[PDB]
Amino acid sequence: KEVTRVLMVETHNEIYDKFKQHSIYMFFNTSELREAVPEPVLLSRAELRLLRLKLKVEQHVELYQKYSNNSWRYLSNRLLAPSDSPEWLSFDVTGVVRQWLSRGGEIEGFRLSAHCSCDSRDNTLQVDINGFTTRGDLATIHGMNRPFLLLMATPLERA
Amino acid sequence: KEVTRVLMVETHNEIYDKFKQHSIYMFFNTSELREAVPEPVLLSRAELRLLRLKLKVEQHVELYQKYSNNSWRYLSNRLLAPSDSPEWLSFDVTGVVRQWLSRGGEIEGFRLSAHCSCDSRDNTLQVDINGFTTRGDLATIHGMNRPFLLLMATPLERA
Going by their DSSP bridges, the two strands A4-9 and A148-153 should be labelled as: antiparallel
Q: Is A1 exposed, middle or buried (0-12, 13-18, 19+ CB in 10 A)?
A: exposed
State whether B72 and A117 contact (CB < 8 Å): yes
Residue A87 · residue A43 · CB < 8 Å:
no
Q: Which residues pair with A72 in a beta bridge?
A: A66
Q: Give me the helices (H) in B21-152, please.
A: 94-102
State whether A127 and B116 contact (CB < 8 Å): yes
Q: CA-nearest residue of chain A to B21? A: A121
Cα torsion B123, B113, A78, A105 to 10°: value is -60
What is the rounded CA–CA span in Å between residue A9 and residue A29?
Answer: 7
CA distance B158 to chain A (A): 32
The helix (run of H) or strand (run of E) holding residue A71 is none
User: What are residue A102's phi and psi, to 5 degrees?
Assistant: -65, -5
Chain A residues touching B116 at Cβ < 8 A: 116, 118, 127
What is the rounded CA–CA span in Å between residue A21 and residue A86?
Answer: 25
- DSSP 8-state code for residue B19: S
Which residue of A117, A128, A132 to mutate against B (max B Cβ within 10 Å)? A117
What experimental approach yielded this model? X-ray
SS3 B36: coil
Q: How many CB atoms lie within 10 A of CB B49?
A: 19
Residue B102 · residue B110 · CB < 8 Å:
no
- DSSP 8-state code for residue B60: E
What's the Cα-to-Cα distance from A76 to each of A53, A64, A114, B12, B60, rounded to whole Å?
20, 7, 12, 35, 12
What's the reported resolution, in angstroms, to a tenth?
3.5
User: Cα–chain-centroid distance for residue B43?
Assistant: 18
What is the rounded CA–CA span in Å between residue B104 and residue A146?
Answer: 46
What is the rounded CA–CA span in Å between residue A117 and residue B75?
Answer: 11
User: What are residue A57's phi and psi, to 5 degrees?
Assistant: -140, 135
Q: Give me the helices (H) in A9-112, please.
A: 94-102
Which residue of A26, A66, A118 to mutate against B (max B Cβ within 10 Å)? A118
* Helix, strand and coil in chain A, % to nearest 5: 10, 45, 50
How many Cα atoms occupy the beta-carbon half-sphere of A10 within 13 Å?
25
Chain B residues touching A126 at Cβ < 8 A: 70
SS3 B101: helix
What is the rounded CA–CA span in Å between residue A52 and residue A69?
Answer: 26
Q: Which residues pair with A74 in a beta bridge?
A: A64
Of B85, B7, B97, B14, whose CA–CA distance to B52 is shortest? B85
Residue type, B13: N
